[PDB]
C-alpha cells in the first residue's frame, strides 16, 4: 500500500533510505500534520522491513536546520515492542537508526505494523496486535441475540426513535459521514472482519451509538441500487485465509431500513448481518514488510499468515 521507499543492500548490512525528514518532539508537532504522518510511516515501514530481514540501518536526511539530538527529542511514534531493537543517533545533517533483527521477540515470528485482523469484544471493535492474532490463528487452525434480529428485518423506523437494543458483541451502531459510500466503503471492512472473527453480528449504519437513537441520512444523498453493489464488491474483496477444507465465502445479509418522521418517507438506515466465519477474515492486507530486492515490499496475506505459523 502506498509509496515506494528505496533501499540498497550493497556491502554488508542493508541501508533503507528514508530521505527527507523533520525531527524532534516539538518541531515534528509543528509540522504539516499531513506530513508528520507521511514521514513517520516510511520510518515504521523500513524499521519493520529490517526487523524481518536480519537487521539494517535507516539513513535519514534531516530537514529542520540546527536539530540537536539530546535537546529536541526524537518525536517519532514507534510501536512499543519495536523499541527494544532501536538505537537512534545523529551525524551532521543526517540521522541513523540501527535495527537489530527481530529474532522472534515475543514468540511472534515476525514484526507486523498492523494485522488488520479485527475482533469485537463487548461494546468495542479493536484490531488484534500480533500477540493477539497469533493466538486466534493458532485457535482457528482447528476444525469442528434475538431482539437484534427482530430489528434487522423491521421495515420502518422513526427519526430519533431510541431503540431498545444496546451495542454489544453482536450489535454495533455506527453513523453516516457526509459521504455515504465513502463512509461505508471505509468503515465497513473493519466491522465485517470483526464480526466474522468473533461470533458474528449486526452493523447498523446510521444509528447514534451513545443513545441508541435512529438517525439515518437524507433519502436522496444515497442510492440503494448501487450501494448494494459497492457493498457487495467491498466484502468479496476482503482478504481471508482458510485453514479448513470447505472454504466458503463470507455469508452476509444487507437490508435497508427506511426511516420516517411525520409519515414522511425520509431517510435510511443501512443494516448488515455478518455470520460467524469458519477461519479468518482480514479487513485489508496485513501491514508487514520485508526487504525483497532493493525495495521495501509488503508481505502478501498468504505469506504473512504462513510466516506467523512457523511458530
Ligand atoms: Zn475456512
Residue numbers in the entry: 1 to 144, 169 to 335
Sentences from the paper on this structure:
The Schlafen family belongs to the interferon-stimulated genes and its members are involved in cell cycle regulation, T cell quiescence, inhibition of viral replication, DNA-repair and tRNA processing. Here, we present the cryo-EM structure of full-length human Schlafen 5 (SLFN5) and the high-resolution crystal structure of the highly conserved N-terminal core domain. SLFN5 binds tRNA as well as single- and double-stranded DNA, suggesting a potential role in transcriptional regulation. The N-terminal Slfn core domain (residues 1–336) is followed by a linker domain (residues 337–552) and a C-terminal helicase/ ATPase domain (residues 553–891).
To gain high resolution structural insights into human SLFN5, we crystallized the SLFN5 core domain (SLFN51–336). SLFN51–336 crystallized in the space groups P3221 and P21, diffracting to 3.2 and 1.8 Å, respectively. The SLFN51- 336 structure depicts a horseshoe-like shape with a mixed α/β topology consisting of 10 α-helices and 14 β-sheets. The domain consists of an N-terminal and C-terminal lobe with respective bridging domain. Each lobe consists of four α-helices and five β-sheets and each bridging domain of one helix and two sheets. The SLFN51–336 structure comprises a zinc finger motif with the calculated anomalous map confirming the presence of a zinc ion. The zinc ion is coordinated by a histidine and three cysteine residues (H266, C268, C302, C303) that are highly conserved throughout the entire Schlafen protein family. The structure of SLFN51–336 shows similarity to the published structure of the N-terminal domain of rat Slfn13 (rSlfn1314–353).
